[PDB]
N, CA and C atoms as an extended XYZ file, in Angstrom:
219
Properties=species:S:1:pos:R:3:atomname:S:1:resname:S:1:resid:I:1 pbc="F F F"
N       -44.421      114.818      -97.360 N   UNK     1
C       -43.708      113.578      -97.613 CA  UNK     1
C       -43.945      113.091      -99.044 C   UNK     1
N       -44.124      111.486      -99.445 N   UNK     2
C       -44.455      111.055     -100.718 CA  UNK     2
C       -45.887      110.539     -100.617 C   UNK     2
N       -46.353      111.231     -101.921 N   UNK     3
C       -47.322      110.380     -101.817 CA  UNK     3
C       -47.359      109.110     -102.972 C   UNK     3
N       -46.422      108.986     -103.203 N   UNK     4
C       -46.830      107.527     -104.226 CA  UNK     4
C       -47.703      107.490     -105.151 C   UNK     4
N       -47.730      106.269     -105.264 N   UNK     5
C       -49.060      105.902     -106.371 CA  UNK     5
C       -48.465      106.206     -107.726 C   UNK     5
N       -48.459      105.633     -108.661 N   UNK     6
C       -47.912      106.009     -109.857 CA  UNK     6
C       -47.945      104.667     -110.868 C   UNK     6
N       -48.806      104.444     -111.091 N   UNK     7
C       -49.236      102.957     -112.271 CA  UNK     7
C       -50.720      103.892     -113.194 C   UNK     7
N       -51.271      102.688     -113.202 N   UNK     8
C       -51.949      102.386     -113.874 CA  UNK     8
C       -52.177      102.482     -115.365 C   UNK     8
N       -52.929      101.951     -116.549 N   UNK     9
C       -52.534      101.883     -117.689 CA  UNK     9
C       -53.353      100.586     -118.098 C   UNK     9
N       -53.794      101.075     -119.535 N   UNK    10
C       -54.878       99.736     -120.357 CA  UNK    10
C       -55.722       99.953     -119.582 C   UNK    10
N       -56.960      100.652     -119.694 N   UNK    11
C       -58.373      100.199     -119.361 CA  UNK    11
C       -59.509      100.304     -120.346 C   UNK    11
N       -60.311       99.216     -120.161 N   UNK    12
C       -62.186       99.451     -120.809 CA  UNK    12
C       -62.803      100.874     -120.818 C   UNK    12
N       -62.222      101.399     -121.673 N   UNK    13
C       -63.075      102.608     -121.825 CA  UNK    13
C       -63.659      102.647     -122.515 C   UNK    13
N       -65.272      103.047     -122.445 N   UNK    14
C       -66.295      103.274     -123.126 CA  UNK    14
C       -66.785      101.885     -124.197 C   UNK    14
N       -67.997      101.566     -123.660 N   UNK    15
C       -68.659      100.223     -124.322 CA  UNK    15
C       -68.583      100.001     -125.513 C   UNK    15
N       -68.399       98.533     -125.778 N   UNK    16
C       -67.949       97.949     -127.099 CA  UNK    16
C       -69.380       97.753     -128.054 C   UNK    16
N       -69.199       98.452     -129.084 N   UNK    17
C       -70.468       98.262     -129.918 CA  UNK    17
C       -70.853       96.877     -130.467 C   UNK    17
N       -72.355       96.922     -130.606 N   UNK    18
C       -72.582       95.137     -131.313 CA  UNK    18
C       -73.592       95.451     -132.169 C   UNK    18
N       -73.511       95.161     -133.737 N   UNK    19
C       -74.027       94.803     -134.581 CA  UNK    19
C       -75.669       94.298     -134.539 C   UNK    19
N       -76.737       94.867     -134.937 N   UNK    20
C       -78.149       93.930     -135.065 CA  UNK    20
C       -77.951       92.826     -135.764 C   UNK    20
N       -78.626       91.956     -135.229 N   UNK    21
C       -79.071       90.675     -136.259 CA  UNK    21
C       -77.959       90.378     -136.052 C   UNK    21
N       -78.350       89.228     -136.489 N   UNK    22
C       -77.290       88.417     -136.924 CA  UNK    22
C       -76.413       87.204     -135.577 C   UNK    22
N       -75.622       88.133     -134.621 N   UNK    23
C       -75.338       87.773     -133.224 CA  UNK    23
C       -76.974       87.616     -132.866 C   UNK    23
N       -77.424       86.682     -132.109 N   UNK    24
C       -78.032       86.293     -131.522 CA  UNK    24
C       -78.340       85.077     -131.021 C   UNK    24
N       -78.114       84.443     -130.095 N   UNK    25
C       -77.763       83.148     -129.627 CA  UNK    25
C       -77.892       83.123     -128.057 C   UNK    25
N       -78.157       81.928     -127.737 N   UNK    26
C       -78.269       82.288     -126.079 CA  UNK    26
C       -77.100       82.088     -125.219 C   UNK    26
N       -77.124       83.029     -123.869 N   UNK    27
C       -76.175       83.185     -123.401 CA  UNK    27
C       -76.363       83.227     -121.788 C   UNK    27
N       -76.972       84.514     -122.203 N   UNK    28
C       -77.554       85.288     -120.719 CA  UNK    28
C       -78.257       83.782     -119.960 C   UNK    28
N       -77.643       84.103     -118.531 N   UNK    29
C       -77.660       83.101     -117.577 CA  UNK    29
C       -78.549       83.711     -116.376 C   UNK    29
N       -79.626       82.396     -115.660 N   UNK    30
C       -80.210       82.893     -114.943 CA  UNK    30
C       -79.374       83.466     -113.591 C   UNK    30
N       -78.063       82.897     -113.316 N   UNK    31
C       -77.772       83.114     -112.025 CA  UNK    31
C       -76.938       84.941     -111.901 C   UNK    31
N       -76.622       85.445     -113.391 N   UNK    32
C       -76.433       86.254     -113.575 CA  UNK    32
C       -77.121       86.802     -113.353 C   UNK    32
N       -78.304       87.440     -113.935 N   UNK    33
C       -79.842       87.962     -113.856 CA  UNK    33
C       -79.790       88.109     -112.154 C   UNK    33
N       -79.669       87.329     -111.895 N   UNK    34
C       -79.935       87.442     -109.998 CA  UNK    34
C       -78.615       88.102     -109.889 C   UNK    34
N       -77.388       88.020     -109.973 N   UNK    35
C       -76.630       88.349     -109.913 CA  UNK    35
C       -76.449       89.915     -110.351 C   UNK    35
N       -77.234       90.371     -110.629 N   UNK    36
C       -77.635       91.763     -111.044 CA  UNK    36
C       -78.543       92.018     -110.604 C   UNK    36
N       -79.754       91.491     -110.516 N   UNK    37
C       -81.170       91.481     -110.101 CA  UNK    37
C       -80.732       91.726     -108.979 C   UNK    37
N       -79.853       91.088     -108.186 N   UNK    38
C       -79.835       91.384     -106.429 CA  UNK    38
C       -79.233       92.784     -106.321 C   UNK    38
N       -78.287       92.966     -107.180 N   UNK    39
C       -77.678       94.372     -107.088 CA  UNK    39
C       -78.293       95.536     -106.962 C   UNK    39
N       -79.615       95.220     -107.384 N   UNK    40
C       -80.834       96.168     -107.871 CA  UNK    40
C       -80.807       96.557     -109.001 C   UNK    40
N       -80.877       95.371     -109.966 N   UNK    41
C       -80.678       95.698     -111.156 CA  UNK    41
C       -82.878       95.050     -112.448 C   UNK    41
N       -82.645       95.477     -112.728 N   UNK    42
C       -83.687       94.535     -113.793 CA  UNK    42
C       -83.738       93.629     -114.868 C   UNK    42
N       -84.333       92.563     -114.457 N   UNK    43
C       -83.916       91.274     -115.348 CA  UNK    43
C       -83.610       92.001     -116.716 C   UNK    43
N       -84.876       92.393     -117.498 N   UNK    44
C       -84.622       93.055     -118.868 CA  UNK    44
C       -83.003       93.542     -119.204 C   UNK    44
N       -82.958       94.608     -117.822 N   UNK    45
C       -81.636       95.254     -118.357 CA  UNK    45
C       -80.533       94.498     -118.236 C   UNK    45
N       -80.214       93.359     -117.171 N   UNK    46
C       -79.298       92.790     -117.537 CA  UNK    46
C       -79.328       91.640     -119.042 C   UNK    46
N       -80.009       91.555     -119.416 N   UNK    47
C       -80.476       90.880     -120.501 CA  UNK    47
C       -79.954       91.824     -121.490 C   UNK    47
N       -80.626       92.702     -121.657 N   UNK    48
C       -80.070       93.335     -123.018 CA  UNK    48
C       -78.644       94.010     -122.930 C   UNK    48
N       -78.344       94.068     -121.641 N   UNK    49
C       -76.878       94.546     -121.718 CA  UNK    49
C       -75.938       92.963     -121.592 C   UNK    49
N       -76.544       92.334     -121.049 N   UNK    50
C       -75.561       90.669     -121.142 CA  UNK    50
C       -75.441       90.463     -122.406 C   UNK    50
N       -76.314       91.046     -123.471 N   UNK    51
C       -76.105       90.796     -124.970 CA  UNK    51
C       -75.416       91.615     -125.260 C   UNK    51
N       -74.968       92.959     -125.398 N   UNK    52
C       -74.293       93.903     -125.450 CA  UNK    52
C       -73.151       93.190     -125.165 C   UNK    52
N       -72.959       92.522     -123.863 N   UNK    53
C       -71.835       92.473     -123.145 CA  UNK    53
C       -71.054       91.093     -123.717 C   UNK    53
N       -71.940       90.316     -124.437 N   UNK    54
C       -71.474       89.068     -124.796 CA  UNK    54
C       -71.663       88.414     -123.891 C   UNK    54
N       -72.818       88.210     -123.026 N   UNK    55
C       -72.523       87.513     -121.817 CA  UNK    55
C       -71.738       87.611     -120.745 C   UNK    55
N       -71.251       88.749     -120.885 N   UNK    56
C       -70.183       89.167     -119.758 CA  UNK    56
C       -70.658       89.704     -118.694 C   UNK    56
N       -70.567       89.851     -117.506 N   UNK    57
C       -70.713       89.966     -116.541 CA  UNK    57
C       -70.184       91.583     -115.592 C   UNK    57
N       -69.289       91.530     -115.168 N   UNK    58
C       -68.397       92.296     -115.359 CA  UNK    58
C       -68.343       93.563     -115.969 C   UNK    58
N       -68.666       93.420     -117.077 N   UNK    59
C       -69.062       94.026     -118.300 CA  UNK    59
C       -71.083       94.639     -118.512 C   UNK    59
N       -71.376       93.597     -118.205 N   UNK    60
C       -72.961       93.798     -118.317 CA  UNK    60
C       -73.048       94.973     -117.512 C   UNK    60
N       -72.153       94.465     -115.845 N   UNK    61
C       -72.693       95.164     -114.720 CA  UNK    61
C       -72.665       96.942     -114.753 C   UNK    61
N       -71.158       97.190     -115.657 N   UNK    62
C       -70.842       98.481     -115.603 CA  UNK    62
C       -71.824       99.208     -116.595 C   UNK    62
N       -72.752       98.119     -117.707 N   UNK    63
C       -73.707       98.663     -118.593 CA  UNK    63
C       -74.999       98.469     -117.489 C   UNK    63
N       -75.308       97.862     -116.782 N   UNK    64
C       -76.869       98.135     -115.971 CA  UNK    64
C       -76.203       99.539     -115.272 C   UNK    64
N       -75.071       99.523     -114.333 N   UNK    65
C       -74.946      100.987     -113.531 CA  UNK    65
C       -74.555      101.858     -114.487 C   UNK    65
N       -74.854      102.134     -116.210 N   UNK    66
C       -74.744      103.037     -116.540 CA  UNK    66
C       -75.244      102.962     -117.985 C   UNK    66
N       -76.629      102.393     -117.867 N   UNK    67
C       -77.362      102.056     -119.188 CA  UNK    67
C       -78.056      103.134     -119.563 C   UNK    67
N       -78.803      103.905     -118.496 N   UNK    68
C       -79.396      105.296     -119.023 CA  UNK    68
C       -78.646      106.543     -119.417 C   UNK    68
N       -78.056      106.801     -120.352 N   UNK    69
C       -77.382      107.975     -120.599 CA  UNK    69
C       -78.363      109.474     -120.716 C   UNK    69
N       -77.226      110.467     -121.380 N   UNK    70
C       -78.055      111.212     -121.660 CA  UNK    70
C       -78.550      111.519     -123.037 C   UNK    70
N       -79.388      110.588     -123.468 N   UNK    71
C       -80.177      110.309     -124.594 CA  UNK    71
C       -81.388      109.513     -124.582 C   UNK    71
N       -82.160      109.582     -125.240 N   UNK    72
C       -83.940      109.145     -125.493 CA  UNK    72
C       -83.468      107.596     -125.605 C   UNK    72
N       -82.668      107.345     -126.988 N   UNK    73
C       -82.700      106.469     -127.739 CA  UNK    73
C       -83.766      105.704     -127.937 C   UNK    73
């Protein structure tokens, strides 16, 4: 028969870089932190990826489920 499906288009691919220094200001929210933290996430990492992320959420989350790559850094 059909199987359909036939969209999609425009997506977030691959994380938006951020500059040292300079950006730094507060953002990162405690209810976020839990809001990740419950996910099974770690305060730290949502922290440094909520900065990454601009405070984003959304955004942070797809950087905690995929902050360890394959690199030392």
């Amino acid at each position: 028969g059909s199987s359909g499906s036939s969209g999609s288009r425009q997506a977030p691919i691959a994380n938006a870089a951020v500059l040292p220094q300079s950006q730094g200001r507060v953002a990162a929210s405690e209810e976020q932190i839990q809001k990740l933290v419950a996910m099974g996430f770690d305060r730290t990492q949502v922290e440094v990826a909520l900065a990454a992320a601009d405070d984003d959420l959304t955004v942070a989350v797809e950087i905690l489920m995929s902050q360890s790559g394959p690199s030392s850094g």
